[PDB]
Design a protein around this ligand. Structure first.
Ligand SMILES: O=P(O)(O)O[C@H]1[C@H](OP(=O)(O)O)[C@@H](OP(=O)(O)O)[C@H](OP(=O)(O)O)[C@@H](OP(=O)(O)O)[C@H]1OP(=O)(O)O
Lengths: 221, 221
């Protein structure tokens, strides 16, 4: 992250060891479940690209996930270079150069370059964009490691309706289908895969019932 | 039917043999089920009263049905004579006489008389009125031959709801109750005679639900 020194100048502060250890616990203990992404986003809050690569070292022992992340990051860097062609010409002395795809990812840049790029009015946030690339890679990894299809999430004969709903929506978060397909899933498949008593009540409830009304009508069933 | 010759004059064309054979198949194979009436109406499309009597010969071997048709036709002819008293007086040379009940049914008229009566501006359609009398007779015949009461149409334990609905409405078409009684039947008896699971859902659906909503809520039940 970025901190101000006693003289009012922006200084890079490394991630503290217990934050890094929290991220290591997330990576090594949670099997890339969907909650790895909110936790990563919280733990890399306000980070520089050099900090993000420190957090990416924890993924390297997981070769398939690390390779998927590398492919996503290379694709994003190439796309960034294509959409930001390197202008050839003079530059104002008070203006800094334009980082490349290998620079936003911190492969060839240095710490002061990233601090200066991020600390500006108006800012060009290099940490947030690299973070979004990482999150796309992690979404792909969560999709790859998902153990069940949404078609296989079915309410047990004695399972409470809220628990089935939580499992259903967690798998839906993992699968990341298209928006229209997701709407069809939540409207139709949730009712279709409920157990007989809840299914009877939900069918009687009619189409277009909100999830809150469905939870109300199935509370003790 | 009526066709125009090469000189532009209206000429009667007989019913083709395969149309008559289609009507014979309807009469001899369908046991006077309710669909005999739409089929008869389609097959006698644009017919003259002389054509209608050719189609009525097919019914003559069925003595009860033929007698019911004859009674209905005699009643309609008598009513037509009563509501159209034979005016005694001069008639315009450019105006034709008024057919009687025995003439619209083609018992005493001739082909040219019927062609001239039907081909006029404005027309006096003798084929359509005789056809409506025939249809009243056929409705009575369909009522007589109906095998089941509407009170006896009950959904089977595994019967799909759409099939029960189709049987119910077909019997209702056969029975031809009064309009208010029919509305009571479709609103109350259909729900009352459904099987337990569909009945539970329909009772939960509430009064005044449309048939489409009932079909939606019972699709796989
Ligand atoms: O309206 P319909 O009286 O039933 O007329 C049809 C129709 O003939 P037209 O349209 O020429 O009057 C058929 O023609 P398609 O368009 O089906 O071809 C024809 O069948 P063919 O094509 O075999 O000529 C058929 O004639 P057919 O009796 O030989 O089956 C004939 O029926 P009618 O002869 O009873 O008028």
């Amino acid at each position: 992250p970025i901190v101000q020194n006693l003289q009012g100048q922006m200084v890079h502060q490394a991630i503290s060891p217990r934050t890094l250890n929290a991220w290591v616990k997330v990576v090594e203990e949670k099997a890339f479940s969907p909650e790895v992404i909110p936790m990563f986003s919280a733990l890399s809050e306000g980070a520089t690209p050099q900090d993000l690569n420190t957090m990416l070292n924890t993924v390297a022992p997981h070769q398939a996930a690390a390779q998927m992340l590398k492919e996503t990051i290379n694709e994003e860097a190439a796309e960034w270079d294509r959409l930001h062609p390197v202008h050839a010409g003079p530059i104002a002395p008070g203006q800094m150069r334009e980082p490349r795809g290998s620079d936003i990812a911190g492969t060839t840049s240095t710490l002061q370059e990233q601090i200066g790029w991020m600390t500006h009015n108006p800012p060009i946030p290099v940490g947030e964009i690299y973070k979004r690339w990482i999150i796309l890679g992690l979404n792909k990894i969560v999709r790859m490691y998902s153990p069940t299809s949404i078609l296989d999430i079915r309410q047990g004969p004695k399972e409470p309706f809220r628990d089935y709903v939580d499992r259903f929506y967690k798998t839906l978060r993992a699968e990341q289908a298209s928006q229209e397909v997701k709407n069809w899933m939540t409207e139709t498949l949730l009712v279709q895969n409920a157990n007989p008593d809840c299914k009877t009540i939900l069918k009687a409830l009619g189409p277009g019932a909100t999830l809150e009304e469905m939870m109300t009508a199935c509370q003790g069933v």
